[PDB]
Design a protein around this ligand. Sequence first.
Ligand SMILES: COCC(=O)NCc1nc2ccccc2[nH]1
Ligand SMILES: COCC(=O)NCc1nc2ccccc2[nH]1
Ligand SMILES: COCC(=O)NCc1nc2ccccc2[nH]1
Ligand SMILES: COCC(=O)NCc1nc2ccccc2[nH]1
Ligand SMILES: COCC(=O)NCc1nc2ccccc2[nH]1
Ligand SMILES: COCC(=O)NCc1nc2ccccc2[nH]1
Ligand SMILES: [Zn+2]
Ligand SMILES: [Zn+2]
Ligand SMILES: [Zn+2]
Ligand SMILES: [Zn+2]
Ligand SMILES: [Zn+2]
Ligand SMILES: [Zn+2]
Lengths: 360, 360
Amino acid sequence: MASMERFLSVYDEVQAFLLDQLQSKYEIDPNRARYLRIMMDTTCLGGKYFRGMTVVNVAEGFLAVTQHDEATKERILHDACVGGWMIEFLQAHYLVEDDIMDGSVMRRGKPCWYRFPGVTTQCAINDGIILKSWTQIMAWHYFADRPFLKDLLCLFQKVDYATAVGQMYDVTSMCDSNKLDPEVAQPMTTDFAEFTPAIYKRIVKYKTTFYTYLLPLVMGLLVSEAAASVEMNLVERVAHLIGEYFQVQDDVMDCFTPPEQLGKVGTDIEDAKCSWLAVTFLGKANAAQVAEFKANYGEKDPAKVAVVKRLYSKANLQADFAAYEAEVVREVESLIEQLKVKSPTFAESVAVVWEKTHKR
Amino acid sequence: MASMERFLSVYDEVQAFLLDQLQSKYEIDPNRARYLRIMMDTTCLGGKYFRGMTVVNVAEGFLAVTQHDEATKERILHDACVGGWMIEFLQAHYLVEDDIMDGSVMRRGKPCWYRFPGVTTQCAINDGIILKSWTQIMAWHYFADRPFLKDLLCLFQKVDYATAVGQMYDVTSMCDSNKLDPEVAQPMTTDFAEFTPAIYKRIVKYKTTFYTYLLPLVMGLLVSEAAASVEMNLVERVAHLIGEYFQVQDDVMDCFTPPEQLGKVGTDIEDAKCSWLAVTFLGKANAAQVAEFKANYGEKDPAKVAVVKRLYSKANLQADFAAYEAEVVREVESLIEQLKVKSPTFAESVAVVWEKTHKR
Ligand SMILES: COCC(=O)NCc1nc2ccccc2[nH]1
Ligand SMILES: COCC(=O)NCc1nc2ccccc2[nH]1
Ligand SMILES: COCC(=O)NCc1nc2ccccc2[nH]1
Ligand SMILES: COCC(=O)NCc1nc2ccccc2[nH]1
Ligand SMILES: COCC(=O)NCc1nc2ccccc2[nH]1
Ligand SMILES: COCC(=O)NCc1nc2ccccc2[nH]1
Ligand SMILES: [Zn+2]
Ligand SMILES: [Zn+2]
Ligand SMILES: [Zn+2]
Ligand SMILES: [Zn+2]
Ligand SMILES: [Zn+2]
Ligand SMILES: [Zn+2]
């Protein structure tokens, strides 16, 4: 059984479980079950399964070096798939809700879920709530008697919370902090004083890294009962680095990747996002370039968006990206080495995570 | 210390904990902390604290009949307040998101949270996510070493899930089940075949009863380590009854309570809600009254709304409500008696829950 095959089969099983339970324990009728099946498929499937497959890969590594009965190998791999789906369904939650929050049009060359004719925002908000509730239903069902259940739920819960806090950092990133006030409509920053590397780093760490990198690695350790093979402060450091890198790639592609390939028309400029491009450009621009960026950023007008893209093009941001990439490659290699002291197997899984990130 | 006083003090403590942790562990800055404090107050405070105070009342009952050290009495009451706030913050989540889902204008004579000028939907969806995450942060913090932690989290998780399923039943209640399809925009029912008492009962049970009645009672038992004093199938039955009653009152008031008193302009008729009024009217109407209801229900037009209110007025629904009330009074009394066999104290708390519901 290829890992991916096992992973995909477990989706089918988990889907059947959740829908069969709705019918037998929550009085659902067949049509509403079908609507939820479609919802689940539409919102959970079609991506790369990077996060969920990380859990599987980490567990697979430990299986190769640890003595177990066959049935135990199976149970561990099944747990790693369930845990991976918990993360994918968490992601699915965040995507449904974020797309609504941001008025997004497309996700993976298909309409965002709320835009489906028979969905609408009124249902989609709640569908997103259900998606995250299913992570917990999965956990309580499949992991009821597992020794790792407490630690898994407690971590999962902190990562979800961090992610929501990250969302708040992201949606408020173009405001002046000192002006935040629920009573007063929020103006866009004029000075862009908060477009700094440390501020950017805080957004990305919370919004993406905890759930995309830390949680899949640590879930893999927890289902393997292997958290003693690592120094958790290192696993955090390496996840922060790789996660930051991931987002900087995504930020560049929002701007420069053709929409057919991206699967999306990128709107970070019109949305006035604190992107790596913006922060990096502000870190090297001259006064006249800074005034021009300010006159044009955060505006729907396509000509103003083209002015911003031009400023970025002539600012030679490809140099800054190569240098940044160089330095991340350097630090990731260093942390992989430190990880080898307690676990070659876990260090190797992080190596694979990094290769898959660095080459995508 | 009056119970309410203790309850309100614990809000202050919990608020400080959550905000202090954001600063010390999640890198929050002071302005975003202030925004979340305001959010928390605006969305969690100002109601009757019925659900949270139920937890406190149930625990207080057991304290009066159970031998404990003073510090243990305090710890139990503190736990009951924390558990009660978990339920109020769960409620706060659902209200923020539902108000957004339904395009609601006012909640408790104040603007819905998403309508605040400095909030907007983009932030409000996420603020609602945070509210529910805080229930879990509270639980893991205050109840880390508690013997009831597992059972409390597992119940809490099932009630939340049921509530989301209830929301789906509610928002789809004016559609024909056989027509639900994410690909096709959903027409309002023309036949109203699904406006039945059993269907209505399913909506209310899921949408309201589990979180408003079952969870506060059972939370009170769990923090008291008293679940053996009751037959859980009875506690479920009595909660379903009282919870149904609560909603039937709310349904009548949406239609007949002046907006100043309601704290809201009621829109259940324009929203084509499967209300008790509608279901009860359809259960007694003649053919001509049925055609008239169909020609007028579920429409913004104020004259069509007034036609519906007239049909309800002349259908003598006050008689049906008195008869329904009569029968609920009868069954609640019967279940209170059954509850006395294992626990007079718990039966008495349910009596208080019912009095507070029946007289509001
Ligand atoms: C077909 O069964 C209908 C029913 O009410 N079952 C029991 C039941 N449903 C619950 C939901 C949440 C928490 C606890 C619950 N217990
Ligand atoms: C859909 O059913 C969910 C469920 O858990 N049913 C059993 C159940 N019901 C409970 C009520 C209180 C405490 C614990 C309970 N356990
Ligand atoms: C209550 O209405 C909310 C709203 O209009 N939100 C933006 C929105 N834009 C859409 C485009 C296509 C389909 C659905 C869409 N929804
Ligand atoms: C001020 O501290 C910043 C930091 O990163 N602390 C550790 C940390 N933050 C976590 C969030 C979720 C899950 C696990 C976590 N561990
Ligand atoms: C805001 O801090 C949240 C936190 O839990 N910090 C400690 C912590 N970090 C962990 C990473 C993996 C496993 C367990 C962990 N525990
Ligand atoms: C992205 O926009 C969503 C939207 O317009 N939702 C309805 C809506 N109606 C409002 C009335 C006052 C204040 C805020 C309001 N929001
Ligand atoms: Zn977003
Ligand atoms: Zn940590
Ligand atoms: Zn992006
Ligand atoms: Zn609603
Ligand atoms: Zn039950
Ligand atoms: Zn109502």
